[PDB]
Ligand binder design. Structure first.
Ligand SMILES: Nc1nc2c(ncn2[C@@H]2O[C@H](COP(=O)(O)OP(=O)(O)OP(=O)(O)O)[C@@H](O)[C@H]2O)c(=O)[nH]1
Ligand SMILES: O=P(O)(O)O[C@H]1[C@H](O)[C@@H](OP(=O)(O)O)[C@H](OP(=O)(O)O)[C@@H](OP(=O)(O)O)[C@H]1O
Ligand SMILES: [Mg+2]
Length: 520
C-alpha cells in the first residue's frame, strides 16, 4: 500500500472509496464514474452506469441530468438504458412524468432537454402503445403539461387556465386529430391537485467557503520536502490561499493562511513565470499550512517556500498583486514565531521517538471570540497572549503529563464554518470552547456543537467543553452551559464541561487531565 498506518481494514477502506466516488461524481460526473470503475465499485457498460445513476444513492440529481444530456456516444447509451429502467406501463402521461422527473433535474440547455424528453416520450409510447399517434404528440403534450404546471402553480402567471382552456389548447395535437376529452381532463386535474414534486439539490457545494473569491486559476506548484511539480486549481479568498487537484473537488488539497508572508519573483530553469511565497522575517522556518493525505486526514505542511509557476507573465502579475493585497499583516504572527522558537526543543524529536510516546489528535472549535487561540498558546507557550482573529487555523503540539496533544485550532468566523468538516478526519478529542458571557450567541454555539458531534467522522470523539471567560461578571456557570448546550439529552457520548479562564489559565490543565483520563 505505502500509506501511513491508520484506520486500515476492509469496511473502512471500501466505505471510504464509496464515499470518495460519490464526492467526485457530484463535482464532475465523468470523473466520479471513472473513479468507481477503477476501484471495482462499478462496471463500465452503459447499462451498469445507468443503474448506478438510476439508484442515485447520495448523487446530486442536477449532476445526473447534466451527464445524461450530453451528446457523447456513451452518454446517449446510458440515457437510453436509464429511461428503460423506468416503468411507465399503465400510467397516464402526468403519472409517468412525475416518476421520470423524480430521477434527475432537467439541464438548462435546449438540446440536452430535447434529447432527454425525446428519450422519455419514446419510452412512454413503447410502454403505452396506441395512446398517442406519434412520439412527437407525446413530447409536445409533455411540454403542454409542464407549461400547465407553471401556469397553475407559479404566482407570476395571473390568468389560471380552466380545464376547458387546457382541453382546447391541445386541439389537433394527436397527428392532426384530438385526444380524448377525458384524458386531457384527467391530466389537467392531476396537475391542478398536485404540482410536480421536484427533488431539490442541496449539498453539492459541500462547503460554501470559496464563494466569490478574490482570484482563482490554474497554477503549477512545487512540493515541500519532495520537490515535485503538480497542477493545482488555486482559490484566493478571505486571507487564505487554497489549492485543489480538480475544479470539481469540493474539499481543498491544501490551505495556506496568508499570515505575514511576502512574494518575490524568481527564475526557474524549467518552469516559466515563477514567484515564491516566503516569510521575510524567519528565513528557513516552516510556513504554516496544511494539506490532505490520501485518507483525508489534514497534516501540517513542510514548506519553507512555495514556488509557483503561472501559465503567462500576465497571470503571474495578477496572482502576485492579488496575493499581496490579501496578506494578513500583524505583529501577532511574528510574536508567536519568535516565542515558539525560543522554547523550541530539538531533543523533543529524539525523545518523542524513543519514549515512542503515544499521543492524541485534538480538534478545537467554537464561535469566533470564544477563546480558542488564547487557550492554545497559554498551553503551548505558558503565557497569555493578545490574539487577533484566526483567518484559517493554528496548530500546535503540546506535551502535558506524558501525553502529546496535537491541537488544531480552526477559525470560528461565520465564513470559515462550512470548512470545519474538513478537519474532522482523525480527530480523537473535540474541544469546544464557549464564551460564557455571550448569552446572545449561546444558542448559536449549541447549534454548531451538535452539527459537529453528529457528523459520521466525529461519532467516536470524546467531548471537552471549555466553559470559558469565567472571570467575567454574570458569566454562565458549568451547570448552565450543560443545559444551554443541550448536553443533558446526550447520554450515549463521553462529555465534560470544564470551567475556564483562558487568560489566567484557570481550568486548562484540568481540561487536559480530563482528556487523558477519558480517552480510549
Ligand atoms: N475576559 C476574558 N477574555 C478572554 C478569555 N479568553 C479569551 N479572551 C479574549 O477573547 C478574545 C478572543 O479570544 P480568541 O482566543 O482570539 O478567540 P478565538 O476563539 O480564537 O476566535 P477566532 O480566532 O475568531 O476563532 C480575545 O481578546 C481574548 O483575549 C477569558 O477567559 N476571559
Ligand atoms: O505527489 P508527490 O510527488 O508524492 O509529492 C507530494 C506533492 O508534491 C504534494 O503536493 P499536493 O499536496 O499539491 O499533492 C506535496 O504537498 P504540499 O501540498 O504540502 O506541497 C508533498 O510535499 P511534502 O509532503 O512536503 O513532501 C509531496 O510529497
Ligand atoms: Mg483564534
Amino acid at each position: 500500500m505505502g500509506h501511513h498506518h491508520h484506520h486500515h481494514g476492509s469496511t473502512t477502506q471500501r466505505n471510504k472509496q464509496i464515499a470518495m466516488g460519490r464526492k467526485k461524481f457530484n463535482m464532475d460526473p465523468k470523473k466520479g464514474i471513472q473513479f468507481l470503475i477503477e476501484n471495482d465499485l462499478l462496471q463500465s457498460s452503459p447499462e451498469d452506469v445507468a443503474q448506478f445513476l438510476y439508484k442515485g444513492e447520495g448523487l446530486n440529481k442536477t449532476v445526473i441530468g447534466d451527464y445524461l444530456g450530453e451528446r457523447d456516444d456513451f452518454n446517449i447509451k446510458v440515457l437510453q438504458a436509464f429511461v428503460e429502467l423506468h416503468e411507465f406501463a399503465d400510467l397516464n402521461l402526468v403519472q409517468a412524468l412525475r416518476q421520470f422527473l423524480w430521477s434527475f433535474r432537467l439541464p438548462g440547455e435546449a438540446q440536452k432537454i430535447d434529447r432527454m424528453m425525446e428519450a422519455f416520450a419514446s419510452r412512454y409510447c413503447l410502454c403505452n402503445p396506441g395512446v398517442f399517434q406519434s412520439t412527437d404528440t407525446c413530447y409536445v403534450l409533455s411540454f403542454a403539461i409542464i407549461m400547465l404546471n407553471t401556469s397553475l402553480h407559479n404566482h407570476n402567471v395571473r390568468d389560471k387556465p380552466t380545464a376547458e382552456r387546457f382541453i382546447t389548447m391541445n386541439r389537433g395535437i394527436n397527428e392532426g386529430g384530438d385526444l380524448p376529452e377525458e384524458l386531457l381532463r384527467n391530466l389537467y386535474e392531476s396537475i391542478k391537485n398536485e404540482p410536480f414534486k421536484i427533488p431539490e439539490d442541496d449539498g453539492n457545494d459541500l462547503t460554501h467557503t470559496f464563494f466569490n473569491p478574490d482570484r482563482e486559476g490554474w497554477l503549477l506548484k512545487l512540493g515541500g520536502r519532495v520537490k515535485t511539480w503538480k497542477r493545482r486549481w488555486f482559490i484566493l479568498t478571505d486571507n487564505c490561499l487554497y489549492y485543489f487537484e480538480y475544479t470539481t473537488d469540493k474539499e481543498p488539497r491544501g490551505i495556506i493562511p496568508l499570515e505575514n508572508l511576502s512574494i518575490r519573483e524568481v527564475e526557474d530553469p524549467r518552469k516559466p513565470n515563477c514567484f515564491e511565497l516566503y516569510n521575510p522575517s524567519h528565513k528557513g522556518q516552516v510556513i504554516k499550512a496544511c494539506k490532505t493525505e490520501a485518507d483525508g486526514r489534514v497534516v501540517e505542511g513542510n514548506h519553507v517556500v512555495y514556488r509557483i509557476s503561472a501559465p503567462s507573465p500576465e497571470e503571474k502579475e495578477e496572482w502576485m498583486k492579488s496575493i499581496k493585497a490579501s496578506i494578513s499583516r500583524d505583529p501577532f504572527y511574528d510574536m508567536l514565531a519568535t516565542r515558539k522558537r525560543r522554547i523550541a526543543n530539538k531533543k523533543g524529536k529524539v525523545l518523542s521517538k524513543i519514549f515512542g510516546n503515544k499521543e492524541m489528535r485534538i480538534l478545537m472549535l467554537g464561535l469566533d471570540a470564544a477563546g480558542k487561540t488564547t487557550i492554545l498558546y497559554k498551553l503551548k507557550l505558558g503565557q497569555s497572549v493578545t490574539t487577533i482573529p484566526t483567518v484559517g487555523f493554528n496548530v500546535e503540539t503540546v506535551t502535558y503529563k506524558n501525553v502529546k496533544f496535537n491541537v488544531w485550532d480552526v477559525g470560528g468566523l461565520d465564513k470559515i464554518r462550512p470548512l470545519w468538516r474538513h478537519y474532522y478526519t482523525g480527530t480523537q478529542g473535540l474541544i469546544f470552547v464557549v464564551d460564557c458571557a455571550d448569552r446572545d450567541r449561546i444558542d448559536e454555539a449549541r447549534q454548531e456543537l451538535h452539527r459537529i458531534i453528529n457528523d459520521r467522522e466525529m461519532r467516536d470523539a470524546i467531548i471537552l467543553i471549555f466553559a470559558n471567560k469565567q472571570d467575567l461578571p454574570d458569566a454562565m456557570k458549568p451547570h448552565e452551559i450543560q443545559e444551554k448546550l443541550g448536553l443533558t439529552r446526550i447520554r450515549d457520548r463521553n462529555w465534560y464541561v470544564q470551567p475556564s479562564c483562558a487568560t489566567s489559565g484557570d481550568g486548562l490543565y484540568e481540561g487536559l487531565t480530563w482528556l487523558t483520563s477519558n480517552y480510549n
